[PDB]
Amino acid sequence: PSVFLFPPKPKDTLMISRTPEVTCVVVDVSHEDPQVKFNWYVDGVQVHNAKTKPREQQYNSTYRVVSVLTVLHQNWLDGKEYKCKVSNKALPAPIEKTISKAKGQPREPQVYTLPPSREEMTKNQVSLTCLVKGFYPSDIAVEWESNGQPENNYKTTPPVLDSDGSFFLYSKLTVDKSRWQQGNVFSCSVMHEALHNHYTQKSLSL
Amino acid sequence: PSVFLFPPKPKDTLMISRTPEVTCVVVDVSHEDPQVKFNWYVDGVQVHNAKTKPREQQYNSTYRVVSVLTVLHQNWLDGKEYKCKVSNKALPAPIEKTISKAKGQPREPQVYTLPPSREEMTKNQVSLTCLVKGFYPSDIAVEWESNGQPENNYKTTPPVLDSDGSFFLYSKLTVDKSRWQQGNVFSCSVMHEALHNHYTQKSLSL
Numbered sequence A, B: 001p002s003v004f005l006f007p008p009k010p011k012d013t014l015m016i017s018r019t020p021e022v023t024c025v026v027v028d029v030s031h032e033d034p035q036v037k038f039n040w041y042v043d044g045v046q047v048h049n050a051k052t053k054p055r056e057q058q059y060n061s062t063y064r065v066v067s068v069l070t071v072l073h074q075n076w077l078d079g080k081e082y083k084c085k086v087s088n089k090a091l092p093a094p095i096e097k098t099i100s101k102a103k104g105q106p107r108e109p110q111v112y113t114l115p116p117s118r119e120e121m122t123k124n125q126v127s128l129t130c131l132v133k134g135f136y137p138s139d140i141a142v143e144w145e146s147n148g149q150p151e152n153n154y155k156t157t158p159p160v161l162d163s164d165g166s167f168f169l170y171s172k173l174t175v176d177k178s179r180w181q182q183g184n185v186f187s188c189s190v191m192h193e194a195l196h197n198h199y200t201q202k203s204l205s206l
């Protein structure tokens, strides 16, 4: 049997309104010893129940047990440890897996929107670019809007560790050549630990 | 004790000057059976020796043996399979791993360069970019120059699968606000399978 600890998604922890949850998944459990026992420890204290919640799935030719511990935004953002310690008679010694966020001192993301190259106006569709650079830790959420209306045709590169020991990423919104010339305003919205309201938005137009 | 097959570097294969290789790395080789036997087959036919060249390395609490095979550019680009067959007494059945490039026909990369943003002119350093979009396969090499001479302070993201079923990547060069302002001419040089001379080079200046 194998244990896998998963962290919360950034938007969920940067929005008060949302629900961060550190998820523990046990694979290869088996039919002969399906008896999995979970021990959730925040930072050192067994948060015992908190509001932990398992269940058994009958997979492969084996079982799959998942439990969830609902993470408290502030505890997350201050860098607690989260330990999922799983007992199961088959498994000789109980597997412990511990998680947190990237140990360091957080840096505010510089957000610059870039309009399309002259040459790309030769094309039928143009590329709108925003750079998010010199941020830390690499937990971020970047989106695009045309108004009070969210957009579709965008793609975001994985956070690349730059030279500073800070991170960078580019995000590419592709639009019809026309709209951009019909003087529309497209915004890139960045969400990060170290942003003023955990949010910033830079805009683009013709 | 398994095997991993590693492909040639996209600059090594796009340049005939340079000698590409396929690297077969066998890990978890345990002490009492150190006898690794690499068998190298090109596509259909065993290139037997060709110019295959291993060596033992005593790691962890185990062994690491790696065998390198040279490639002919042409073969690689014509999409031949390369087959590494590992032997080691302990390992009951022989490990036959096989590699090759991606299937599909090349798309010529669109190399556009973007200037620093006005919002970034506020900084003692600015960021030059080239967006390299709509290519295929993912294998490419972006490098940066300023005159007759190469530069240091660039960082290029991994190739991200875009909607076309083609790729993009951005590459970010960081220079002094001064150098940019003195009116110097920076170059983005993209090397890709489907470009005229396996090379193209888009330029920036102030």
Ligand SMILES: *[C@@H]1O[C@H](CO[C@H]2O[C@H](C)[C@@H](O)[C@@H](O)[C@@H]2O)[C@@H](O[C@@H]2O[C@H](CO)[C@@H](O[C@@H]3O[C@H](CO[C@H]4O[C@H](CO)[C@@H](O)[C@H](O)[C@@H]4O[C@@H]4O[C@H](CO)[C@@H](O[C@@H]5O[C@H](CO)[C@H](O)[C@H](O)[C@H]5O)[C@H](O)[C@H]4NC(C)=O)[C@@H](O)[C@H](O[C@H]4O[C@H](CO)[C@@H](O)[C@H](O)[C@@H]4O[C@@H]4O[C@H](CO)[C@@H](O)[C@H](O)[C@H]4NC(C)=O)[C@@H]3O)[C@H](O)[C@H]2NC(C)=O)[C@H](O)[C@H]1NC(C)=O
Binding pocket: A004, A006, A007, A008, A009, A012, A019, A020, A021, A022, A023, A027, A028, A059, A060, A061, A062, A064
């Ligand atoms: C018996 O069968 C089962 C199931 O089999 C399927 O297929 C059969 C054909 C079919 O018949 C059925 O049985 C069934 O469909 C087998 O199970 C699989 O077992 C393997 C291991 O053998 C597991 O592999 C691991 O996977 C990890 C990734 O897992 C995520 O992705 C996979 C693939 O997308 C998903 O399946 C999986 O569910 C995970 O998705 C994420 O899940 C979480 C929790 O649900 C989501 O959480 C969100 O949380 C927020 C909180 O706010 C919110 O609540 C959201 O709503 C939630 O959704 C999250 O959203 C999901 N993610 C996304 C993007 O959506 C791998 O990371 C893991 O890899 C690490 O470990 C292995 C092992 O050591 C290493 O080899 C590997 O290299 C890597 O190691 C190191 O890890 C670091 C962290 O990743 C990494 O940074 C580091 O670089 C790395 N080191 C190196 C050197 O690379 C591993 O691959 C499968 O997950 C599991 N499948 C399932 C479906 O459970 C079983 O094996 C089989 N038994 C047999 C064959 O014997």
Ligand SMILES: *[C@@H]1O[C@H](CO[C@H]2O[C@H](C)[C@@H](O)[C@@H](O)[C@@H]2O)[C@@H](O[C@@H]2O[C@H](CO)[C@@H](O[C@@H]3O[C@H](CO[C@H]4O[C@H](CO)[C@@H](O)[C@H](O)[C@@H]4O[C@@H]4O[C@H](CO)[C@@H](O[C@@H]5O[C@H](CO)[C@H](O)[C@H](O)[C@H]5O)[C@H](O)[C@H]4NC(C)=O)[C@@H](O)[C@H](O[C@H]4O[C@H](CO)[C@@H](O)[C@H](O)[C@@H]4O[C@@H]4O[C@H](CO)[C@@H](O)[C@H](O)[C@H]4NC(C)=O)[C@@H]3O)[C@H](O)[C@H]2NC(C)=O)[C@H](O)[C@H]1NC(C)=O
Binding pocket: B003, B004, B005, B006, B007, B008, B009, B012, B019, B020, B021, B022, B023, B025, B027, B028, B059, B060, B061, B062, B064
């Ligand atoms: C005992 O210890 C050793 C080492 O331990 C370290 O730490 C100790 C504390 C210390 O005391 C020392 O012992 C030591 O420092 C353990 O070994 C490790 O074992 C793991 C697991 O077995 C291996 O994991 C695999 O790693 C692959 C990535 O490997 C690259 O990165 C690592 C990290 O940087 C490098 O170390 C490694 O060398 C590889 O770098 C690339 O290497 C090639 C060949 O050297 C380079 O080639 C260039 O070629 C050009 C050609 O022109 C030119 O010649 C250049 O000069 C050459 O250099 C290349 O440059 C390097 N790359 C770069 C960027 O520089 C992973 O990809 C691999 O992942 C696959 O498998 C896992 C497991 O199943 C999956 O989870 C994962 O998803 C992935 O699967 C992929 O799936 C696809 C779908 O099926 C499939 O299609 C695809 O084919 C498949 N991918 C592959 C590759 O098959 C995997 O994680 C480590 O590599 C190994 N580390 C070392 C240093 O050897 C050992 O386990 C341990 N024993 C124990 C614990 O019992």
